[PDB]
């Protein structure tokens, strides 16, 4: 008799299971961005479908409409804030013209790879998972983070981590113990 917790599904499987075009296209995407399932691509396409549906049912209404103006400006602002949509493209049809690689280009994994602290998206993935990162001054261990176009100036290594100092590390301390034993 308490208020039920709301929950939602964040993805959607495609209609046709086996078609080679979608299969190898999304496998190219997963290989280029360092993902572990098709579920991430499904989630991103689900978010894009919702965004495109909002843009469609806003465009059915004419301009000068308060709802269209309000929510179109809100959506455009949220996209240019996350950096998936460039500043010149703010006309609500490029929002329809977006694709999933624009969203995947803003994940923390590929952002670390572009900043060059990884040398590979898989290195970025294991770094983020192993807590050697701080998007502001706070550790984040989620690769699908969607940085907000102002945090790239603050993406760096965590202060309480190796590659940020203040302790060498576990197997480094082990090797120091073994070489102190050999010193004895």
């Amino acid at each position: 008799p308490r208020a039920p917790r709301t929950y939602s599904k964040t993805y959607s499987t495609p209609k046709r299971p086996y078609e080679s075009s979608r299969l190898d296209a999304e496998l190219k995407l997963a290989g280029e961005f360092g993902l572990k399932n098709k579920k991430e691509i499904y989630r991103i396409s689900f978010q894009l479908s919702k965004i495109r549906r909002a843009a469609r049912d806003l465009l059915t209404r004419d301009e000068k409409d308060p709802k269209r103006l309000f929510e179109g400006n809100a959506l455009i602002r949220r996209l240019v804030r996350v950096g998936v949509l460039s500043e010149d493209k703010k006309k609500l049809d490029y929002v329809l013209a977006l694709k999933v690689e624009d969203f995947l280009e803003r994940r923390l994994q590929t952002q670390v790879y572009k900043l060059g602290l990884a040398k590979s998206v898989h290195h970025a993935r294991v770094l983020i998972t192993q807590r050697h990162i701080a998007v502001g001054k706070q550790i984040v261990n989620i690769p699908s983070f969607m940085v907000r176009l102002d945090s790239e100036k603050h993406i760096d290594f965590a202060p309480t981590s190796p590659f940020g100092g203040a302790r060498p590390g576990r197997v480094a301390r082990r090797n120091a113990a073994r070489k102190a034993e050999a010193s004895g």
């Binding site: 008799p1 308490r2 208020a3 308060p66 103006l69 309000f70």
Partner: protein, 258 residues
Amino acid sequence: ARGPKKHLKRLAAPHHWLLDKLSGCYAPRPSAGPHKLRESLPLIVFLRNRLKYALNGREVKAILMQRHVKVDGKVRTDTTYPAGFMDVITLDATNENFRLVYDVKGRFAVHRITDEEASYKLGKVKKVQLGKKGVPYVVTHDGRTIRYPDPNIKVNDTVKIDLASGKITDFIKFDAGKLVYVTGGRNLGRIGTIVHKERHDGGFDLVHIKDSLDNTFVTRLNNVFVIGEQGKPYISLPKGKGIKLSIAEERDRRRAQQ
């Protein structure tokens, strides 16, 4: 069923209390008092959720039982006493004075007032009648009975109450050009200067009401509370003074002051 209900679940409470849907199965049911439980505010939710002066019903009870808080001059050490529209709440500690008025979103605001303003309240008369032995009396919106009124005081008028005694200082009539407070419905919280009212003998007399920005609307006569004539009000209005900014200009102001 079988008698009166004594509980009130969350998700059944009125939404303008701003009770979170989590943190408990139940809501504080207002006890019987001068106002309907829908258009009321318990002292527990007023002290805890609006003023943050307490964190628990236990702390609200600890405040109440030592007779700190008083409403309309009476102490009222009840956790679920229904405080309604224009009820004044005096905290002698902190020498604070609040008047329960709606903000324009339709919820009760923390409108701090001074002491000379806290020394009275307005009441909308609901019926004028003849009591026993021919004594005339009025009934205000908070169930107050006041005997021997002025004979010109008819229904849907506003009387100013002394709040130490139950006497009437003066009264505002009801016609065009009067500053009103909308208490009920979709336009709950606006202030809009009656232009004219249409009768419709048989139910729900309507009144047309236009704010300072010339944005007109219409309301049933049940939800209107005249608070003076145009310009000067008889009370201190809260922030905004009932304009009902659209969402566009609201976010423009939020981007202005930030």
